[PDB]
């Protein structure tokens, strides 16, 4: 009998999740419970953190009769999910009498069914608590615009200064070529700024360009900022939950 089973009709969500994790995190624990699938891991430098939430109710069927912690090589899992088509329905299942994760991919209307059994691994990981808090500045913007800004400025310098005020948000970098600033005014195609107070922070662009690999999950991204605190970069996974990245501000 299967003690965990989750059927996801929009299987491309899981493909996209693994492309957004595997370059930043090598191996992670999937925490599976009756309320859903959670994953948290710091990168190996401890400068950033990723938190995934997929709620049991966003799955077309979901069953879990006990808490599991499955250690996963995210590069292996990514390789397996590349064998799934974008329209496929994906089932995850784990029997208690195994140490594998089963994945089932069903092409729809075409009878092709694929089943993979993935070897799991043992992972002892520290879990971090996120203090609930309100942010001085919250920016909502097109995800493709943000990805473009982080890509372009990384040809200018290794750090980005994010200045946010009521009217707009500015991104700045400086390096051997010269310097560059990109300014977005407040306007899916919108740029919106909820600001309590002006903030000015500096972040490593190398990490932001791992985070923007989640761009395919959502047409908008949300940046939350306050002095002295990690940036939060959030991609909503419509009808399921979210992928959030946290990055510690860079000094000198």
């Amino acid at each position: 009998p299967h003690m965990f089973e989750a059927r996801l009709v929009q299987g491309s969500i899981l493909k996209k999740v693994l492309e957004a994790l595997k370059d930043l995190i090598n191996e992670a624990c999937w925490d599976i419970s009756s309320s859903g699938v959670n994953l948290q891991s710091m990168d190996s430098s401890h400068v950033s953190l990723v938190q995934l939430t997929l709620r049991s109710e966003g799955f077309d069927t979901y069953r879990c009769d006990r808490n599991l912690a499955m250690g996963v090589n995210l590069t292996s899992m990514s390789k397996i999910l590349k064998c799934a088509g974008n329209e496929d329905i994906i089932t995850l299942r784990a029997e208690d009498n195994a140490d594998t994760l089963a994945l089932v991919f069903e092409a729809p209307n075409q009878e092709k069914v694929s089943d993979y059994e993935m070897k799991l691994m043992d992972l002892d990981v520290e879990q971090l608590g996120i203090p609930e808090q309100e942010y001085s500045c919250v920016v909502k913007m097109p995800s493709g615009e943000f990805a473009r800004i982080c890509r372009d400025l990384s040809h200018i310098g290794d750090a980005v200064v994010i200045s946010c005020a009521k009217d707009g948000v500015k991104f700045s970098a400086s390096g051997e070529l010269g310097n560059g600033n990109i300014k977005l005014s407040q306007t899916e195609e919108a740029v919106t700024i909820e600001m309590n107070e002006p903030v000015q922070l500096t972040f490593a662009l190398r990490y932001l360009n791992f985070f923007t690999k989640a761009t395919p999950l959502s047409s908008t991204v949300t940046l939350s900022m306050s002095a002295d605190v990690p940036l939060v970069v959030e991609y909503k996974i419509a009808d399921m939950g979210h992928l959030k990245y946290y990055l510690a501000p860079k000094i000198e």
């Binding site: 400068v47 950033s48 608590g129 605190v229 510690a248």
Partner: peptide, 13 residues
């Protein structure tokens, strides 16, 4: 030294 996520977010487990 470098600023880390652990400088703001406590271990809980």
């Amino acid at each position: 030294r470098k600023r880390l996520i652990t400088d703001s977010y406590p271990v809980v487990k």
